[PDB]
Each structure stands twice: as C-alpha cells, then as structure tokens.
C-alpha cells in the first residue's frame, strides 16, 4: 500500500530467485588464477609475447564511435599482400589473420600495412636449428637481447592532439552552415518526390 508521493515500485523479485544466486567472493581468487595462468603460459612459450598473436587496427563500426580505433581480430588478406607477408608465413611468425574482413578503403588498408611493417621491423627470428642459421633468421647478438613481451603487441596510443591555431579565412566566414545543413536534409527527404515529378513531366 504505497502512501504519498513515491516512485512506483519495480523490483523484479516475484520469481523463486533464491534458487539462482551468484556471489562474487571469488573475484580476487579468479584474479590470482588468471595471473598464474599467464605466468605458466609465458614460461611455456618464452620468448614469444605472452599476449600471443599480433592484432590489427580497426575503426569502431557506428558513427557514435567511428572517430576511435581499436584492436581488431586480425589482418585481412589484402593487408597481408600489401605488406608482402604470406598467410602461411603469418601463421608461423605469430600474426592473426582475419579471413572474414576485407578492405574497401585505401586509408584503412594502409594503416594495417604499416602496422605489419613495424611488427616485422621489431621481430626477432630465431634460427630453426640453433647450430645452423639461415636467411631471414636474426643475427647472433640480436638473439641475445631477446626478451618476452608482456601486454598487447604494439599497443595503440589513445592520446588526443589539438590542431594548431590558425587564421580565420574569409571564405570560411561567408558560408551559411545552418542553411547548408537544412538544404541537405531537405534534398535527401524530397529526393524521391522530385524524381516522381520528373518522370511525370517526361511522360507528359
């Protein structure tokens, strides 16, 4: 029996909720277990990076996020070709391949091609047989500085830069921004009606 000015109740507790209860008392235990798993994996695959495969750069899908980039699943075959890396070779040297993604824009393709290039620059390849090196394998003293990498491979930078102050140009001021926006909206909204009118005029 609510009395007076109250917000109407909404609590979803009319089911037998006592049969489905989940607590979080094992949160620090899970943290410790995951740290130990990472340590074991690092020991297992040393000196390879603990994170694993190298991931690609990606624009966030929708216009709410399209000004931000993030790590993708892998590198498209177009990017691998642009960087001159075979898919088979990439799987061996630890680069993620996204067989579903395709590039439709030069800028997006080029960003990932450059990422692959810098990864190859930073790569250290051990000889397949320690006794006998080959072509492509890293040099002896290079193989001494090898160290296991922790965290993301080639982590992304999220710092925001500010455009340098400049002069306000006259042509910039003479533009009618609101009129332009409303004109674009109107043109899109009435595009079809004008086409219908044009077709009728042609038929007459």
């Amino acid at each position: 029996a609510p009395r007076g000015n109250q917000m109407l109740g909404n609590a979803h507790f009319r089911k037998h909720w006592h049969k489905r209860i989940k607590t979080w008392f094992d949160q620090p235990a899970r943290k410790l277990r995951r740290r130990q798993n990472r340590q074991a994996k690092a020991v297992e695959i040393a000196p390879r990076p603990v994170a694993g495969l190298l991931r690609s750069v990606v624009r966030c899908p929708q216009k709410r996020y399209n000004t931000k980039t993030r790590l993708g699943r892998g590198f498209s075959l177009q990017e691998l070709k642009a960087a001159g890396i075979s898919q088979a070779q990439a799987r061996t040297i630890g680069i993620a391949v996204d067989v579903r993604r395709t590039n439709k824009t030069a800028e997006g393709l080029k960003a990932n091609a450059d990422r692959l290039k810098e990864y190859k620059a930073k790569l250290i390849l051990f000889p397949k047989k320690a006794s006998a090196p080959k072509k492509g394998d890293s040099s002896a003293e290079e193989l001494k500085v090898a160290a296991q990498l922790r965290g993301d491979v080639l982590p992304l930078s999220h710092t925001i830069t500010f455009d340098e102050p400049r002069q306000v140009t006259d042509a910039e001021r003479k533009v009618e921004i609101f009129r332009l926006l409303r004109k674009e909206r109107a043109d899109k909204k009435y595009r079809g009606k004008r086409e219908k009118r044009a077709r009728e005029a042609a038929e007459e």
Binding site: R3, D163, P165, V168, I177, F178
Partner: protein, 144 residues
C-alpha cells in the same frame, strides 16, 4: 546500525508502534501497485498523472546510437581550449576546437562568447550557435 533503529526503543511496548486497533497485518491494501484504478485511484491520479493509457508511435527495436547526439553550448567552448593552445593563439590566430574528439556532436547557442574568435568544427550546428560564433568573429566548419 541496529543500535540506532526504532526496534531498540520499541522493546516493551506491545504493539511495536503499529497501533492496537489497526495492527500490522500482511497486505491490507493489496500487493505492489495494485488497485491503481479502483481503490488507489486518488493516490495514483494525484501523484502520477499520465500513468494509465498509451500515447505515441511505437518503435520496434529502437536504435539509440543513431539518436545519440551529445551537445555543447557556445558558452562552454572556451573552457574546452587547453591553456597551451590559448597561449599559442596569438597574433590573430584563432584556436581550433574539434568537438567530435571532445565527444560533442552538435553545438548549441546558449550564452555569450569570449573576445577571442574561435574556429569550431562539429557535425551539427544550431542557427544561433552559428550566428553567435560568426558575430564574435570565428568560423563554423562542418565535419563528417
């Protein structure tokens, strides 16, 4: 803090502060927000007008990311300019504010603008925002 609750001071009084006539009794008026149209009608109408009924178009699977459009007023634009950029903005050079990177999509024209003209880059502008910026001497630049 059980020590500060009413139960501590109600020990020894038979009814526990609920009366000898009415008595505390389970659900004397119904459970939840029941009876909002019959015997809780006065309360519902007095405190929650507009509750019953339905109004407006109904959108199957609304897309909130499309209507997402955070806004900033012209009066707050200068505070977005960092001090270093203000220092560099000398000799007629106006600071350039890219509202999209700061998280604002539309610029609204509430308040007054500072003396320094500003170049503002945003996806949408209101008419008053454009007029005030241009009157202050800056320019509005449309970005995608």
């Amino acid at each position: 803090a059980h020590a500060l609750r009413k139960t501590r001071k109600l020990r020894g009084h038979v009814s526990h502060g609920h009366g000898r006539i009415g008595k505390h009794r389970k659900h004397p008026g119904g459970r939840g927000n029941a009876g909002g149209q019959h015997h809780h009608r006065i309360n519902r109408d007095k405190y929650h007008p507009g509750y019953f009924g339905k109004v407006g178009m109904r959108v199957f699977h609304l897309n909130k990311n499309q209507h997402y459009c955070p806004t900033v007023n012209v009066e707050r634009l200068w505070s977005l300019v960092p001090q270093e950029v203000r220092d560099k903005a000398t000799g007629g050079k106006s600071p350039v504010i890219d509202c999209t990177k700061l998280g604002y999509f539309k610029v609204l024209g509430k308040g007054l603008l500072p003396e320094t003209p500003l170049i503002v880059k945003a996806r949408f502008f209101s008419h008053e925002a454009e007029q005030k910026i241009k009157k202050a001497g800056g320019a509005c630049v449309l970005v995608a």
